[PDB]
Amino acid sequence: MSRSNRQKEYKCGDLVFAKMKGYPHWPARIDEMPEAAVKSTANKYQVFFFGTHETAFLGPKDLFPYEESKEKFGKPNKRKGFSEGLWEIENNPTVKASGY
């Protein structure tokens, strides 16, 4: 009916700030590496970027929680893809689950 928040440890369905090489910490969701379309590898995690709306192979080193993010900054450069991006996650287009 709607994504479920984690307990004590982050897991699939967990939304955090994922940054990429040349790209500032963007709002990306956590995802596990599937093995259907292709054969994933080890020591790697699936990350889904909202702003860009694309997936990228990242890990925990490329993902930071709000607690930590807010600890230092938690607020990356405010770009065009940042506004619509952060809103792309907070205000997805294909909504359905109660949320604002």
Side-chain angles (χ1 to χ4, degrees), residues 15-81:
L15 183 276
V16 269
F17 251 120
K19 81 284 221 293
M20 200 132 102
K21 286 265 255 280
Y23 209 66
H25 241 138
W26 240 232
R29 205 164 100 203
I30 228 296
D31 322 71
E32 252 208 80
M33 69 216 166
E35 62 201 311
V38 294
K39 301 133 243 159
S40 286
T41 59
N43 53 88
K44 74 137 245 207
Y45 241 33
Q46 185 172 278
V47 162
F48 241 77
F49 273 54
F50 273 103
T52 59
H53 211 127
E54 65 164 72
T55 305
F57 305 114
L58 282 192
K61 181 231 160 119
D62 270 276
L63 262 179
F64 248 51
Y66 155 68
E67 245 204 34
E68 264 233 291
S69 106
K70 71 95 148 94
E71 221 242 298
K72 168 77 256 193
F73 256 50
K75 54 105 139 193
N77 317 263
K78 175 105 95 127
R79 282 275 271 196
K80 272 207 284 107

Side-chain angles (χ1 to χ4, degrees), residues 2-17:
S2 160
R3 68 183 136 289
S4 247
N5 62 278
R6 73 242 92 68
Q7 359 81 56
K8 79 235 218 159
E9 57 145 281
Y10 82 136
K11 75 154 279 111
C12 208
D14 170 66
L15 183 276
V16 269
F17 251 120

